[PDB]
Amino acid sequence: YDIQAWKKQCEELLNLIFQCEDSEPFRQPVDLLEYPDYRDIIDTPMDFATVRETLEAGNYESPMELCKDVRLIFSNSKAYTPSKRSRIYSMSLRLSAFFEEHISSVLSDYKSALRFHKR
Ligand SMILES: O=C(O)c1scc2c1OCCO2
């Protein structure tokens, strides 16, 4: 029932993601010199360093907000990919499964703790 526990749990999950080779294309903002049409397809770029910095700045109020930004990294990869068999998109799918598998309990514990607070 710790309402604040999600933050360190998300920090640790981000550390695991950064160690994962599958996160390499997503660690920093997509290089617009390497992909000049990126902003023609993608309205809101997102990457893991931006997620970590937002968390560390105290700019997420809940793990659901962090989850929305991480999911945006994956949906941007899906929208930008020229193929569902592309290398970078395939890395995003594996990383998304890993993230969803690990974020589930963080969200559940947070929601449980908030419900206990409001009881
Ligand atoms: O070049 C590709 O196949 C892909 S698939 C997703 C991407 C990307 O390149 C830039 C980052 O997002």
Curated annotation (Swiss-Prot):
UniProt domain Bromo: residue ranges: 1-106
Domain of life, source organism: Eukaryota
Cell compartment(s), UniProt: Nucleus
Positions bearing Phosphothreonine: 44
Residues carrying Phosphoserine: 90
Tissue: Expressed in myeloma and epidermoid carcinoma cell lines.
Disease link: Chung-Jansen syndrome: An autosomal dominant disorder characterized by developmental delay, intellectual disability, autistic features, anxiety, hypotonia, obesity, and dysmorphic features.
Task performed by this protein: Probable regulator of the insulin and insulin-like growth factor signaling pathways. Stimulates cell proliferation through regulation of cyclin transcription and has an anti-apoptotic activity through AKT1 phosphorylation and activation. Plays a role in the regulation of cell morphology and cytoskeletal organization.
Subunit: Interacts with IRS1 and IRS2. Interacts (via bromo domain) with acetylated lysine residues on histone H1.4, histone H3 and H4 (in vitro).
Protein name per UniProt: PH-interacting protein
Lineage: Eukaryota, Metazoa, Chordata, Craniata, Vertebrata
Residues of the full protein shown: 1316 to 1434 of 1821
